[PDB]
Design an enzyme around this catalytic site. Structure first.
Site, PDB file in Angstrom:
ATOM      1  N   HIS A  34       0.956  -1.781  -0.204  1.00 40.80           N
ATOM      2  CA  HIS A  34       0.403   0.104  -0.162  1.00 40.80           C
ATOM      3  C   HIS A  34       0.769   1.677  -0.224  1.00 40.80           C
ATOM      4  CE1 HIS A  34      -3.275   3.053   1.099  1.00 40.80           C
ATOM      5  NE2 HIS A  34      -4.563   1.906   1.004  1.00 40.80           N
ATOM      6  N   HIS A  35       1.062   2.484  -0.986  1.00 35.22           N
ATOM      7  CA  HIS A  35       1.277   3.775  -0.957  1.00 35.22           C
ATOM      8  C   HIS A  35       1.365   4.471   0.453  1.00 35.22           C
ATOM      9  CE1 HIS A  35       3.563   6.662  -2.909  1.00 35.22           C
ATOM     10  NE2 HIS A  35       3.914   5.746  -3.271  1.00 35.22           N
ATOM     11  N   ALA A  36       0.468   4.109   1.234  1.00 36.78           N
ATOM     12  CA  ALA A  36       0.086   5.418   2.404  1.00 36.78           C
ATOM     13  C   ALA A  36       0.974   4.930   3.158  1.00 36.78           C
ATOM     14  CB  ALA A  36      -1.052   4.698   2.768  1.00 36.78           C
TER      15      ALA A  36
END
Ligand SMILES: [Co+2]
Ligand SMILES: [Co+2]
Ligand SMILES: [Co+2]
Ligand SMILES: [Co+2]
Ligand SMILES: [Co+2]
Ligand SMILES: [Co+2]
Lengths: 213, 213, 213
Positions: free
Chosen positions: C188-190
């Site tokens: 996930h890019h978060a």
């Protein structure tokens, strides 16, 4: 007005656009390897840097094809006369990335001057969008220099009417006698098909193999 | 009735199907390279064309495994006795693709005759679905001949209960002494797992290495 | 409490986390090839098996970086002190996969004993989660031994606040003088960016090249 309202009433790809836009919303990604052997040589006989020339070269090719410059503005389907690249910059002190852009120019030396100044001005600015609002007539360019990849793909929750191409580069590598660069292209199927992606990649490859100026 | 209603009450993969269908709806794509060295030789001693034989060969393998022939019909989980391929055709004058299909046949020469006639009939038809409604017992096949890819992946918004395999081919290339074909396989996890995709690819490779007729 | 509540108030990546978490929910996958030439040699002079050492080695690297050990618990952003791997096991009689886990250990021989016992206990258990509830402090590891892939990618419908890395391995292959292993990393890019994925892969490669014990 830096765009032309597209005659969609009359467009030959009319059915295709609505199918992939609303019937079966779809995009795809594909990673291909660009031979940058010639390019490396060109760089070598010059004072240009790698990231800056790739940016320039990708923006240059995106700017020869209309379908890579499409968007929705006013719920209307437009074509941008020109697009400016929004590229990523790594901040070593925070481990985050900033997204920057600067004006595109057919003159590479003018491009370079535009690039260096935006870089000078925002080098220590770790905000995500240091310049504020992203210009609508853009393309995203990014680079993962630390690792070589055969594949890359973005998994984005919602992608409604976002037609700007997203291009990602990896670390090049020596594949025998050739130097190759994995480049990932991600687009929406409403405006761009497999033919159009291939045509961009064949064009970028040509450009990597040509003189800079 | 060209399908059998699957005994899901009793199916050993029952839990797996509902988990990946409703709990964590999931599919995946994988690109692998098929050695088509032998195939090229076979073609060479024949009058068969490449796209037509790949279609035939992929449909032939999809037709030996049940899990690649699954679907929902009547909210029931079925298995198709047989599937017919829906392949793409590029229209040079419009830069769009049409999707066509024709009946599968264990007799390759009969396959070829079916293919050529559908091609003759709809060659200048740039509609998206020139034949109308796609047959439910299908598989999608497509080809991007202009560019070599190491990866390909479709990003589709919603994929609910769509179990037909999507297969994409790229331009082959000479990887030393071998001729390889990047082939992307995309499926739903409810009916097909990594084992089943691998088993299809190992089977297709076998077939590429065997006599045509 | 086997986690620390992360000071997000003060976190330098604060803006980045909320943008990629809520503004443009995004993750990506990338497949890279790990040279396991050295590793094969190490295995050869030992009694360790391949799947078990890769598990250990991946869990070991995930456990040196915090960003690969993030999660949401209590709507709070946490960091796990340590994570245990959840790996897949193929059941030949049913053509389905089970997901198993066992406790991570810095002592490889203790790891191996943990692995063999979980394997012994659940070998004939074809349930999907034979041990029941998956431990929250985990990572997913899986292997597709039957086929070599250049790319792999999971297409998951919803991915809200699921920050555990998913790692997939393919069949290795001889690429000249090197033995390489395609490894797909999906995150996930978060919480994780391209830098952090590259840093994990560079670390895993180091570890493959080092003594086991
Ligand atoms: Co509509
Ligand atoms: Co122009
Ligand atoms: Co259900
Ligand atoms: Co049959
Ligand atoms: Co928010
Ligand atoms: Co620790």
């Amino acid at each position: 007005m830096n765009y032309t309202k597209f005659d969609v009433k009359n467009w030959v790809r009319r059915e295709h656009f609505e199918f992939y836009r609303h019937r079966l919303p779809c995009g795809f990604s594909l990673t291909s390897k660009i031979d940058i052997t010639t390019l490396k040589k060109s760089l070598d006989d010059s004072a240009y840097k790698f990231y800056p020339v790739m940016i320039y070269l990708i923006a240059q090719a995106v700017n020869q094809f209309d379908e890579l410059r499409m968007a929705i503005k006013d719920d209307e389907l437009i074509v941008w006369d020109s697009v400016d690249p929004q590229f990523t910059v790594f901040h070593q002190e925070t481990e985050t990335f900033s997204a920057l852009s600067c004006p595109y120019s057919s003159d590479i030396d003018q491009f370079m001057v535009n690039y260096l100044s935006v870089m000078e001005r925002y080098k220590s600015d770790t905000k995500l969008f240091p310049q504020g609002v992203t210009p609508e007539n853009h393309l995203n360019i990014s680079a993962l220099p630390w690792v070589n990849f055969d594949s890359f793909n973005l998994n984005v929750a919602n992608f409604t009417d976002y037609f700007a191409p997203i291009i990602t580069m990896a670390k090049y590598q020596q594949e025998g006698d050739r130097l190759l660069l994995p480049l990932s292209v991600q687009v929406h199927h409403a405006v761009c098909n497999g033919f159009h992606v291939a045509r961009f990649i064949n064009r970028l490859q040509e450009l990597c193999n040509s003189k800079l100026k």
